[PDB]
Design a protein around this ligand. Structure first.
Ligand SMILES: *[C@@H]1O[C@H](CO)[C@@H](O[C@@H]2O[C@H](CO)[C@@H](O[C@@H]3O[C@H](CO[C@H]4O[C@H](CO)[C@@H](O)[C@H](O[C@H]5O[C@H](CO)[C@@H](O)[C@H](O)[C@@H]5O)[C@@H]4O)[C@@H](O)[C@H](O[C@H]4O[C@H](CO)[C@@H](O)[C@H](O)[C@@H]4O)[C@@H]3O)[C@H](O)[C@H]2NC(C)=O)[C@H](O)[C@H]1NC(C)=O
Ligand code: HEM
Ligand SMILES: *[C@@H]1O[C@H](CO)[C@@H](O[C@@H]2O[C@H](CO)[C@@H](O)[C@H](O)[C@H]2NC(C)=O)[C@H](O)[C@H]1NC(C)=O
Ligand SMILES: *[C@@H]1O[C@H](CO)[C@@H](O)[C@H](O)[C@H]1NC(C)=O
Ligand SMILES: *[C@@H]1O[C@H](CO)[C@@H](O)[C@H](O)[C@H]1NC(C)=O
Ligand SMILES: [Ca+2]
Length: 595
């Protein structure tokens, strides 16, 4: 009765009964529907796609084609009028460390990646899009409004290329266009290990049966590993400093070097795998390389799950946590674990938590050198500042001692991302992540703000006064009505992020609902969830309960003082204790077995 078949790329693998570990692809997690949550398949649709032609063309593609009787505003004009601000004074979150932002980006990279269409190779398509700003097939350029300064300094557009879609990637089909999730839907440390067998093997050290991940052979951090380099050319990390010539890192996720603190967090996770593999080898000398790798991978997946659900989500969702994510009751094989298309926009709330600067701090939590503090835009695809300017410890100290940006209806996205974003192959620090998010909402066929309010059982404002009430902000509602003309047309990214945050949380009610529903699904629909009986033993679960980001730092850096609650705002020295007082992960329950 349905077109359920379509999975034409079809990374098809048969499933082995009673297999002890996760697949790299996420296949075989659900026994009845083994592709559920596997990588390189369609993002789930919680609601039907909304395209100007019903099938594939974004709203805004055809100038004369209205949405609900009104032209959709230019993404860059919404960015300029609503999202932008000048003054960074007073914008920081007084109760969230910068690790709060950074953990969000890490979790996001574990869960979803909808990359730009490949569209063949060695052609004049990408250059054409960038050079002449001509909309066509996959070229969906972000056009500058008449009063945009970038129209004066940067040409007529910011190049933008439509996301990849499942069955054919160049041609189309009879159903609506469905974008791809290139990573595993499960919270499974796919950002460390990869979501594809080829990358997963490339990341491993298969020279020794020690179960290790490959490490950098060119540079070391006071005896501790860096990720290997990606020696693919051209390299955006080389591009931004051709004197230093330091390549990007190779990780489980394609995007690991996008900014210096994401590369930092990736480095901690790689180190933690190798520490666990060494410690398991000492405990279990007869375990082979495959077994050591899998058991360390399983522990690192559980770490990521526990930090996320115990420490992170409660301070994102605040009062809505118990509504959307009740205490775990067990694996439910009827739950759809696939990441939804809308979730990939909902989780971009993080863009409003990114502050304008990154600091390096020394062994006394004092400024590291004469340029301790640097503008964020100079740190896009920046790996040389790690290798050649103190390794990761000074950056990790900044992650603990400095703050996230607080979402603000009058100060949404810092100009470091809104005007100075660097994109690989596009040469300039001149892109706008907010405009890109809005253009991508349309590229993906997103239903508008009121469709999602209805989905979440919330009021659907129809008038300026109704929107002013929901947003608790007259001027913001007025600016959104002036541009969108009806709240039905407001793009979900800006509408969800415009709502005032729930008590004890950092998102409003619409985003709490969309995020909370997704995180409930990826937990309840995961046969390898850490708390599911038989994944770990009772004694292993008791040991895992004691994981902390503070212990991760103590174990995989030379930092000797850390806070106990690393996601809150912490000040040195008052909130910092000796590493020796921080709980350890007791691996004794991983003994092959005893009597
Ligand atoms: C995968 O996992 C393997 C290990 O299982 C990694 O292999 C090892 O890499 C490190 C470098 O990253 C190598 O260490 C070097 O060691 C020498 C000291 O050599 C002596 O001790 C070694 C350790 O036991 C041993 O392997 C050596 O034996 C080999 O070489 C001799 C000839 O010297 C030969 O007779 C033997 O038969 C072996 O072939 C030897 O006993 C040390 O001198 C090196 O340091 C120098 O170089 C670094 C920069 O490179 C510099 O910082 C120093 O100041 C100095 O200049 C270096 O520490 C180790 O030898 C490798 N082990 C094996 C078995 O080859 C591998 O790197 C992992 N790969 C990835 C991609 O992660
Ligand atoms: C640079 C960028 C960041 C930090 C300096 C950053 C940060 C975050 C946080 C903190 C997130 C969540 C808590 C988060 C989520 C998602 N991002 Fe974003 N991000 C930076 C840069 C980008 C760029 C560039 C993109 C691609 C934009 C496009 O549409 O082409 C981007 C995306 C996302 C994303 C969607 C992932 C996907 O499914 O494809 C998040 C869920 N980020 N980032
Ligand atoms: C590119 O990287 C190099 C380091 O490899 C940076 O240079 C250092 O910068 C200051 C001088 O301005 C000094 O600490 C060193 O003498 C420099 N080293 C070298 C080799 O020149 C350089 O500033 C970076 N440039 C950019 C644009 O990021
Ligand atoms: C900071 O947030 C944490 C929860 O994230 C909370 O327990 C603590 O009371 C908050 N502190 C202040 C000062 O509000
Ligand atoms: C399992 O999932 C289905 C679909 O969400 C749900 O209707 C059912 O109540 C769930 N079973 C539980 C919570 O035991
Ligand atoms: Ca994953």
């Amino acid at each position: 009765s349905w077109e359920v078949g379509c999975g034409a790329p079809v990374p098809l693998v048969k499933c082995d009964e009673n297999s002890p570990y996760r697949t790299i692809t996420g296949d075989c997690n659900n026994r009845r529907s083994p592709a559920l949550g596997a990588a390189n398949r369609a993002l789930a649709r919680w609601l039907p796609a909304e395209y100007e032609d019903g099938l594939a063309l974004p709203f805004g593609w055809t100038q004369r084609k209205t949405r609900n009787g009104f032209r959709v505003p230019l993404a860059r004009e919404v960015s300029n009028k609503i999202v932008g601000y000048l003054d960074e004074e007073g914008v920081l979150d007084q109760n969230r460390s910068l690790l709060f932002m950074q953990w969000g980006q890490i979790v996001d990279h574990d869960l979803d990646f909808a990359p730009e269409t490949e569209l063949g190779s060695n052609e004049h398509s990408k250059t054409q899009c960038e050079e002449y700003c001509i909309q066509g097939d996959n070229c969906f350029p972000i056009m500058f409004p008449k009063n945009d300064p970038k129209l004066k300094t940067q040409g007529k557009c910011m190049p933008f290329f439509r996301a990849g879609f499942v069955c054919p990637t160049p041609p189309y089909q009879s159903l609506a266009r469905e974008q791809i999730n290139a990573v595993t839907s499960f919270l499974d440390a796919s950002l460390v290990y990869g979501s594809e067998p080829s990358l997963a093997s490339r990341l491993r050290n298969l020279s020794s049966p020690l179960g290790l991940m490959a490490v950098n052979q060119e540079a070391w951090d006071h005896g501790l590993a860096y990720l290997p380099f990606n020696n693919k050319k051209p390299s955006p990390c080389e591009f931004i400093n051709t004197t230093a010539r330091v390549p990007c890192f190779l990780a489980g996720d394609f995007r690991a070097s996008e900014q210096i603190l994401l590369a930092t967090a990736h480095t901690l996770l790689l180190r933690e795998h190798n520490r666990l593999a060494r410690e398991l080898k000492k405990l279990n000398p007869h375990w082979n390389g495959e077994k050591l790798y899998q058991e360390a991978r399983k522990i690192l997946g559980a770490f990521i799950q526990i930090i996320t659900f115990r420490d992170y989500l409660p301070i994102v969702l605040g009062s809505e946590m118990q509504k959307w994510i009740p205490p775990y009751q067990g694996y439910n094989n009827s739950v759809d674990p696939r990441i939804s298309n809308v979730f990939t926009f909902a989780f971009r709330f993080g863009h409003m938590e990114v502050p304008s600067t990154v600091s390096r701090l020394d062994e006394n939590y004092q400024p590291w050198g004469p340029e301790a503090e640097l503008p964020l835009h100079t740190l896009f695809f920046n790996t040389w500042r790690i290798i050649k300017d103190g390794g990761i410890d000074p950056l990790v100290r900044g992650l603990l001692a400095k703050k996230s940006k607080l979402m603000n209806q009058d100060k949404m996205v810092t100009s470091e991302l809104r005007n100075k974003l660097f994109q690989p192959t596009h040469k300039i620090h001149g892109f706008d992540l907010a405009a890109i998010n809005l253009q991508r909402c349309r590229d993906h066929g997103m239903p508008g703000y009121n469709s999602w309010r209805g989905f979440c059982g919330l009021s659907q404002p129809k008038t300026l006064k109704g929107l002013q009430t929901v947003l608790k902000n007259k001027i913001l509602a007025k600016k959104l009505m002036d541009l969108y003309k009806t709240p039905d047309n407001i793009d979900i990214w800006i509408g969800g992020n415009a709502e005032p945050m729930v008590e004890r949380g950092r998102v409003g009610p619409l985003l709490a609902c969309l995020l909370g529903r997704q995180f409930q699904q990826i937990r309840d629909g995961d046969r390898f969830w850490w708390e599911n009986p038989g994944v770990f033993t009772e004694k292993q679960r008791d040991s895992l309960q004691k994981v902390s980001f503070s212990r991760l730092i103590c174990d995989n850096t030379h930092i000797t003082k850390v806070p106990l609650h690393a996601f809150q705002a912490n000040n040195y020295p008052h909130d910092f204790v000796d590493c020796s007082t921080v709980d350890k992960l007791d691996l004794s329950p991983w003994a092959s077995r005893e009597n």
